[PDB]
Structure 1
Amino acid sequence: VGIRFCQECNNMLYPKEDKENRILLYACRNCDYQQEADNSCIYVNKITHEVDELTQIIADVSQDPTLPRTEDHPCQKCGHKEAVFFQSHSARAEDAMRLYYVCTAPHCGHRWTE
């Protein structure tokens, strides 16, 4: 999945085949540094990719003066009443007009979606 780098030349490690022990080795093209990986999966491609933005929503959006606010949706963690909300606010999100919420209490930053 991710990119792993050689410790000698600090270049990308390409996958190379070990035709003796039937094992996967990551080797670079600059030096002869070898490795054994734990992912065991070279490549992964998901075409749905309906990523939940709760990973990508920052908790600092609560300081936006231009966002709507509601008090009928208390925070799950700290029980604070006021909570900002907004839509997907991102492209490649199909057409879902689902709402997203962020707690406005400082240092809480709870970001959920009912």
Structure 2
Amino acid sequence: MLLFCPGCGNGLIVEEGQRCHRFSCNTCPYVHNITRKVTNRKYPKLKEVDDVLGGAAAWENVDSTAESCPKCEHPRAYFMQLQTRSADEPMTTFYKCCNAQCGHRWR
């Protein structure tokens, strides 16, 4: 991330000093000792999973005492939650039922 000097407002660079790594200006004496953990997360966009889950994928989210699907009232359905974009998104819930003489897609 860009961080700028309170004095002159040039762009800081990271360098190493005699006790710590420092943010330092190139044109004025201002330096800032990195005393503790500092971070910057990108969170990029992941791949689309819409066609990845269709067609009997290797799902695993099913559990004992899981709810039956609301239409068929049988537990013959898988359900999963995934982030569709980056992992700061709250996970969405979705489910699909596949039974004899019964094909449907639900949300």
Q: What is the TM-score normalised by the length of structure 1?
A: 0.36
Higher strand proportion (structure 1 or 2): 2
Q: What is the TM-score normalised by the length of structure 2?
A: 0.38
